[PDB]
Write a protein that binds this ligand. Structure first.
Ligand SMILES: NC(=O)c1ccc[n+]([C@@H]2O[C@H](COP(=O)([O-])OP(=O)(O)OC[C@H]3O[C@@H](n4cnc5c(N)ncnc54)[C@H](O)[C@@H]3O)[C@@H](O)[C@H]2O)c1
Ligand SMILES: NC(=O)c1ccc[n+]([C@@H]2O[C@H](COP(=O)([O-])OP(=O)(O)OC[C@H]3O[C@@H](n4cnc5c(N)ncnc54)[C@H](O)[C@@H]3O)[C@@H](O)[C@H]2O)c1
Lengths: 268, 268
């Protein structure tokens, strides 16, 4: 087969080989997709990493907070997939929040600026990628972003939770605009995954207490999941994003798909 | 009686005599509350207006985006309610979004800056008022903000809907912090009210199309409300905020109370 046979998907947000984008990309490729990657600030590093990928892919630099990068994106993508072709899928796997809006530092103490940097990169950027790529997408195209159920407060993820609730609200508006092009836009809500970043944190980088709390959120997750939750295998999330990028979920947009072991549907 | 007998509530967000804060304030007063008001930029105007209020109240200037105003707030409030006393309620009835993130101008075209100004004043400010006043609140105190169900996209309210979803997420975090002081924090989701601002808009200030859309959202509202919805009487919203400020809803925080005629519970 190739669930994504002959499709053209752009993928963003690869840093290390434990980035969730990294896995989405790998599975996408085993699934016949043909990619184009974007990276942020360590390009040679992302470059080196991305080679272990099952197959080659052009890599474009893109700082989601950069006007030009954005203005030039579609141009650059077409040079690479080559003129005459369009995108079938776009993945927004990116996000960020200053240390101050998140860890240990109390909720009221994060200054708006940091918080705004956060919302800029984490939520607003979904809109900007859309606006930039939509003109080059085929109908039936699919835009997907990564979420973390912000629907109930929790410790430590402070303002980042605020930025995900804002992201979920942007998705519904992006869905309205994308539909005029025949394109879907949805999010995926993942359970906690031991990414590099997370590791450092349960490892005590945002402070001891923050770490202990995450660590506990993490264990509550697998207890509650009727099918369990393994924080060290991003696989089950990759596959979902893949399902969404394909043609099998054709009537769903401005929506959230929970890839979290069923944890959110159980109280305890 | 005096539902709010001998309570001390601070009230913000009065501009004209059609501001929702204006009514909350009036009903609060008929209910025995003793207020302190904050105003923004037209102080003499707010001053003049506030005199028609059923009773006198000190007015303090406060631009929610001003570090000092904020640092000095509690000082100023105590000078006025007078040393030895504390606040029992605080009302956040304020909000704003640049013309560019809202009306007619397409969703993707609002620049982050305007959008950020919006989120600053509209959502983040709930956190900052909290942080500023909590140290002076009595236990059993109640903080309340005004919401507009952002839970499903709609036309024209573009980024302002995004800012309300972010507000609802902040409320849950403010609720976590307030509880350590014995204080509740909730929001109120109102139906559309013919405030000055709104008028101008259904009147075609944000463009014709924006106006026509609101106008229709407005009429869908009363059809759906099993008990109807009158956009020209803010009364039923005042009363609710009042219920929340009192002691009759003592076990509810980080929550949303719908004061919207029951519209949100019906499909059509
Ligand atoms: N790890 C989790 O437990 C978890 C759970 C659910 C959802 N998510 C989301 O998955 C997404 C990917 O996170 P990850 O956990 O794989 O982390 P990750 O740290 O590997 O990747 C996040 C990406 O954001 C990029 N970034 C920061 N600023 C940027 C900018 N200006 N322009 C472009 N890229 C920028 C980084 O290069 C990085 O590739 C995030 O949105 C995260 O919120 C993660
Ligand atoms: N009118 C509606 O149909 C409707 C519906 C539901 C919820 N709400 C909310 O009710 C709240 C009050 O709105 P209103 O409709 O009564 O409008 P209004 O325009 O009379 O008042 C909003 C207030 O925001 C203040 N403002 C702007 N920037 C400020 C700043 N930097 N510092 C302090 N104040 C600032 C203004 O002075 C004004 O008093 C808003 O949050 C609005 O979103 C309104």
């Amino acid at each position: 087969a190739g669930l994504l046979d002959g499709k053209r998907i752009l993928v963003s947000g690869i840093i290390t080989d434990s980035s969730i984008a990294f896995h989405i990309a790998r599975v996408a490729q085993e699934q016949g997709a043909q990619l184009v990657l974007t990276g942020f600030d360590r390009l040679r590093l992302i470059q080196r990493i991305t080679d272990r990928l099952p197959a080659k892919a052009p890599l474009l630099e893109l700082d989601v907070q950069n006007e030009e990068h954005l203005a030039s994106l579609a141009g650059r993508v077409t040079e690479a997939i080559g003129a005459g072709n369009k995108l079938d899928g776009v993945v927004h796997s990116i996000g960020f929040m200053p240390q101050t809006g998140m860890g240990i530092n109390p909720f009221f103490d994060a200054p708006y600026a940091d918080v705004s940097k956060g919302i800029h990169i984490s939520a607003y950027s979904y809109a900007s990628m859309a606006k930039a790529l939509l003109p080059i997408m085929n109908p039936g195209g699919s835009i997907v972003g990564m979420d973390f159920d912000p629907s109930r407060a929790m410790p430590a993820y402070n303002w980042m939770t605020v930025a995900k609730s804002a992201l979920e609200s942007v998705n519904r508006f992006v869905a309205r605009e994308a539909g005029k092009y025949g394109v879907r836009s949805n999010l995926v809500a993942a359970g906690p995954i031991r990414t590099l970043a997370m590791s450092a944190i349960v490892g005590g980088a945002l402070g001891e207490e923050a770490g202990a709390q995450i660590q506990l959120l993490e264990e509550g997750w697998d207890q509650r999941a009727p099918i369990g939750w393994n924080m060290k295998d991003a696989t089950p999330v990759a596959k979902t994003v893949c399902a969404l990028l394909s043609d099998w979920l054709p009537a769903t947009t401005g929506d959230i798909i929970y890839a979290d072991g069923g944890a959110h549907t159980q109280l305890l």
